[PDB]
């Protein structure tokens, strides 16, 4: 790997610089190099990893959606034939997206998840696993689509089971996991009622536990709770 010669600490330092410079591809490459050193990641380091790849794939997803919409319009009655170029370029973007998702999944499988024993680390990685299978599912149209969707579901479910046993209802990781799994239900699994029920119960259970928190923890939890509320408002 091209980062093999760079110190772990220098990779982390450079990932933080890359973030400041909004150079998210570089940030992701640095954090991939840091993961591949083989040591477990701290909380801060897990956050750098997640932010880098979230931003890289987020941009790919937005571009894929623009291209897929143009491609759909091209297949409507009365649309002039323009050749294979729209499909080819959507395929190009799609293949690069799938590559990034496979790279993240590969870091999680080799060997972040298996070394993560604390609930906060293990839930965080399993959530990432669900998220990157969800991004694969968004673009899947073949023989494996069902298996891809099930992979996402299984990862999210294991994370949920741990989170409910080991974390308080206000814990930001528990909250973020639930937010995303609720979106999975709505957008991927064709289960809007499940999505709504999960978002509502998560919100309500968190609300009831806010009284136990410091001001700073309250801020963290309520920020994510508002995203649950935002989704519920969109869906109801």
């Amino acid at each position: 790997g091209a980062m093999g010669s760079m110190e772990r600490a220098s990779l982390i330092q450079k990932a933080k610089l890359a973030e400041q410079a909004e150079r998210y591809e570089d940030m992701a490459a640095f954090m991939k190099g840091a993961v591949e050193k083989g040591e477990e990641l701290s909380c801060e380091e897990r956050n750098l990893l997640s932010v880098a790849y979230k931003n890289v794939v987020g941009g790919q997803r937005a571009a894929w959606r623009v291209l897929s919409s143009i491609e759909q319009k091209s297949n409507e009655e009365g649309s002039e034939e323009k050749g294979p170029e729209v499909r080819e370029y959507r395929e190009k973007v799609e293949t690069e997206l799938q590559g990034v998702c496979d790279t993240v999944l590969g870091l999680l499988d080799s060997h972040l998840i298996k070394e993560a024993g604390d609930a906060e680390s293990r839930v965080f990685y399993l959530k990432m696993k669900g998220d990157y299978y969800r991004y694969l599912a968004e673009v899947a149209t073949g023989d494996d689509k069902k298996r891809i969707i099930d992979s996402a579901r299984s990862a999210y479910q294991e994370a949920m089971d741990i989170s409910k046993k080991e974390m308080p209802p206000t814990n930001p990781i528990r909250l973020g996991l639930a937010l995303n799994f609720s979106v999975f239900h709505y957008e991927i699994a064709n289960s809007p009622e499940e999505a709504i029920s999960l978002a509502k119960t998560t919100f309500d259970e968190a609300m009831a536990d806010l009284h136990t928190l410091s001001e700073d923890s309250y801020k963290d939890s309520t920020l994510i709770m508002q995203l649950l509320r935002d989704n519920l408002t969109l869906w109801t």
Binding site: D131, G176, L179, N180, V183, Y186, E187, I224, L227, D230, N231, L234, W235
Partner: peptide, 5 residues
């Protein structure tokens, strides 16, 4: 699109 984190 709905919110995710």
């Amino acid at each position: 699109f709905p919110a995710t984190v």
